């Protein structure tokens, strides 16, 4: 019901809301932000301009990745823009 879109990784900076704000996206964690988020404008467009990469609210900041997911190199897979069971948009 809730899983990745994993469409190709564009240049568009990620956008996170109030709620999600601290979280390294995949490791769920606040620890050691280092490097930066990219998603496809397909995932990120329009009403999604500065939209949360989780909940559907306006982005007030920019998710940083952990270092943990870094050395395991996951940040480079398909764009982590979570699609819920329903149409994203």
């Amino acid at each position: 019901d809730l899983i990745f879109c994993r469409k190709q990784a564009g240049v568009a900076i990620g956008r996170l809301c109030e709620k999600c704000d601290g979280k390294c996206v995949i490791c769920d964690s606040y620890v050691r932000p280092c490097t930066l988020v990219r998603i496809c404008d397909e995932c990120n467009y329009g009403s999604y301009q500065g939209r949360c990469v989780i909940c559907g609210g306006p982005g007030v900041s920019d998710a940083y990745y952990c270092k943990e997911c870094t050395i395991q190199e996951k940040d480079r897979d398909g764009c982590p823009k979570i699609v819920n069971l329903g149409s994203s948009k």
Binding site: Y45, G46, N84, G86, K89
Partner: protein, 290 residues
Amino acid sequence: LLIDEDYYARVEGREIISNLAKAAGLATMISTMRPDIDNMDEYVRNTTARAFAVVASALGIPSLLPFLKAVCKSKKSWQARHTGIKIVQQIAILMGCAILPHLRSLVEIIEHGLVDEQQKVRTISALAIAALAEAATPYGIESFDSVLKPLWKGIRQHRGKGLAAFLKAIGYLIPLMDAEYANYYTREVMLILIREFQSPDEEMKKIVLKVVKQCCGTDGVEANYIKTEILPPFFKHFWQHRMALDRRNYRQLVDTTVELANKVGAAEIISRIVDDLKDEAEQYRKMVME
């Protein structure tokens, strides 16, 4: 359920109609769902479309195209075609930014509508072109290409909901043109736009509004010109208490006025709407304020 007032209702619905459609087979879905196309009730059509929208998000457009493309060439009756076109639309809305590749084909369906004898089919058709472009954004311009030259002509001769619809399109086009070609064509529209502020229709005022956002929402349009022709009408007929009580119009408005600022400057706008913070009724005030 899919055609649902509640936001979370809908999204559930879509979720399961995919889960079914992908779950079942394509040819299952089709062989299933023809006959609802010509079903007398417009409702069941309408919804039936949004179904096909979803099943298409599941199984991809190109799987499903030859089917559609078949439908819009159905010569038995129009009611279908009214549907099949609608389908194009709700595809547009759902698949959105991703429509891009088969854009050309989709359009190559839908053109044969615009000229039709029946009205609605014209109407809905064009409407789709709009939605397309709105997912097209600044892209695929020439794919829409062979569409225009009717559209512009169509603009001239019309009375009614259809008319403003064709605007809904053109408006969403202009951002996609070359401000030399777009230049010309723009200069033609902003007239009809003018003459049309005034209608009682609300479908209208939404439309012509969003247009101005785009027409005079342009880089290749000249400042003074807006300052003269448009503004005084604009603030006249639109800024009124009809509007802001409604929801959408509230927003769409705010947007529009904002973009007229981004161009003609600030003090111009704000100057004219300051005096209304002290008008009594709230929602209005709230509006000027934001």
